């Protein structure tokens, strides 16, 4: 079984779930060369060692699986944040990582962000990291705590960047509407041409807001569901489960309460529906969640308590299976 | 640690 961890990545093609990186206590990053594969249909794990341009071991990286080609951006290693971009073709032989020297201006070095996949584009939003090298489209807000306990200050951004896989070129779309505030540890989910984003941390709050960016027109929209909404949080997962539902699980509140609540956001109804499940005693923060082809949401890793208290952090290696559809 | 900041 894979070692416990938080801040790893997990991506899938609906049947196989690829898990990489992250860190644990007793702190250290998990081995960079390992790639763990969970077969969603059988519940078994397989460890494969990779070669090539292996990325440094990181937490907070942002990854996707498109046609069984994995792509990884950003993260935080022993020497801080990065804006490097890697590809790992998993289709067919020893897997080889490829660090892509992209054209255009990359996003600033950062972690704890989100991404939407839409046709040939990978669209990245937000995150936490260094001051961008130059003034680009969007806003950056420093985290005042980063100036006293560090040699290099950091902050949040609301930046939207496209990595076009036709040419491996970075760009920023000109957006209309009001973008969500700069944030990190938010969660992104895509359904068709709508790139949803929920929650996240900004300044002294872990937020409860929900927006979508139209990935064809580049117009931002704020969603105002009526009635009861989930509590504000960061470090939660948001996973599309059908053409009309997003599944929300776990996270951490503004007042540092670990969460075990689950909800479905019904897009057509613009309404949140609380989801009953057998894991109320299993809150998770910084876990990952992948949808299977069987309607399930497979949650892995993450921490059961306040991982900000590193010596008491309860990092997990459990798989929690939510039967959503 | 530096890895958990900003969350």
Phi and psi for B2 in degrees, rounded to 5? -70, -20
Both tokens of residue A281? 């005693």
Name the token pair of A71: 């792509």
| Cα–Cα distance, A284 to A305 (Å, whole number) | 7
Method: X-ray
Q: Can you tell me the distance from the alpha carbon of A278 to that of A266, in angstroms, rounded to the nearest whole number?
A: 22
Alpha carbons A74 and A81: distance in angstroms, whole number:
7
Q: What is the dihedral of CA A308, A313, A315, A321, to 10 degrees?
A: -80
Whether residue A230 contacts residue A204, with contact meaning beta carbons closer than 8 Å, is answered with no
Letter string b/e over residues A148-166, b meaning 16 or more CB atoms within 10 A of that residue's CB: eeeeeebbbbbbbbbbbbe
> Choosing among A307, A309, A311, A315, which should be mutated to test the B contact, i.e. which has the most B CBs within 10 A?
A307
- How far apart CA A161 and CA A121 sit, in angstroms, is 10
Please list, in sequence order, all residues whose beta carbon lies within 8 angstroms of the beta carbon of residue A276, skipping any fewer than 6 positions away: none
What is the distance in angstroms between the CA of the first residue and the CA of the last residue of chain A? 27
**∠ CA A276-A237-A173 to the nearest 5 degrees?**
140
Q: How far apart are CA A250 and CA A235, in angstroms?
A: 7
Give the DSSP H/E element, type plus range, for residue A189: strand A187-191
User: Tokens at residue A170, please?
Assistant: 């970075």
Integer Rg of chain A from CA? 18
Between the CA of residue A283 and those of A185, A232, A260, what are the distances in Å? 16, 15, 4
Do the chains contact at B5 and A146, CB–CB below 8 Å?
A: yes
**What is the β-pairing status of strands A114-118 and A121-130?**
antiparallel
What whole-number distance in Å separates Cα of residue A296 and Cα of residue A284?
17
| Residue A98 · residue A88 · CB < 8 Å | yes
d(CA A147, CA A131): 12
The SS3 assignment for A5 reads coil
C-alpha A61, offset from chain centre: 7
- What distance in Å separates the CA atoms of residue A215 and residue A45, rounded to the nearest whole number? 35
Under an 8 A CB cutoff, do A76 and B3 touch? yes
Which tokens in the block code for residue A253?
């509140």
Tokens representing residue A152 in the block: 């290099």
Contact residues, chain B to chain A, C-beta under 8 Å: 1-7
- The answer to whether A185 contacts chain B (CB < 8 Å) is yes
């Amino acid at each position: 079984c894979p070692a416990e961890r938080s801040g790893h990545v997990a991506v899938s093609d609906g049947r196989h779930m690829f898990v990489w990186g992250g860190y644990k206590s007793n702190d250290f990053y998990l081995p960079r060369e390992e790639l763990w594969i969970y077969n969603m249909e059988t519940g078994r794990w397989k460890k494969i060692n990779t070669e090539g341009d292996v990325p440094p071991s990181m937490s907070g990286s942002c990854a996707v699986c498109v046609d069984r080609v994995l792509y990884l951006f950003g993260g935080h290693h022993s020497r801080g944040n990065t804006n490097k971009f890697y590809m790992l073709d998993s289709r067919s032989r020893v897997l080889q990582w490829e660090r892509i020297d992209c054209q255009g201006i990359p996003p600033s070095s950062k972690d704890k962000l989100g991404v939407w996949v839409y046709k040939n584009k990978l669209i990245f939003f937000g995150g936490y990291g260094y001051l961008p090298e130059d003034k680009v489209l969007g806003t950056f807000e420093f985290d005042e705590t980063s100036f006293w306990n560090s040699s290099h200050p950091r902050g949040w951004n609301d930046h939207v960047h496209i990595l076009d896989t036709e040419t491996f070129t970075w760009s920023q779309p000109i957006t209309t509407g009001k973008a969500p505030s700069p944030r990190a540890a938010h969660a992104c989910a895509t359904v068709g041409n709508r790139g949803f984003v929920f929650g996240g941390r900004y300044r002294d709050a872990r937020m409860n807001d929900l927006h979508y960016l139209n990935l064809d027109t580049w117009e931002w929209n704020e969603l105002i569901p009526q009635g009861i909404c989930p509590v504000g949080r960061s470090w939660h997962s948001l996973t599309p489960v059908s053409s009309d539902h997003l599944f929300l699980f776990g996270g951490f509140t503004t007042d540092k309460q670990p969460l075990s609540d689950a909800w479905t956001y019904c897009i057509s109804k613009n309404e949140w529906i609380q989801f009953n499940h057998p894991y109320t005693e299993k809150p998770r923060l910084w876990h990952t969640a992948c949808a299977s082809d069987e309607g399930e949401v497979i949650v892995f890793g993450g921490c059961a308590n306040n991982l900000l208290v590193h010596h008491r952090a309860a990092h997990s290696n459990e798989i929690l299976i939510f039967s959503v559809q | 640690s530096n890895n958990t900041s900003g969350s």
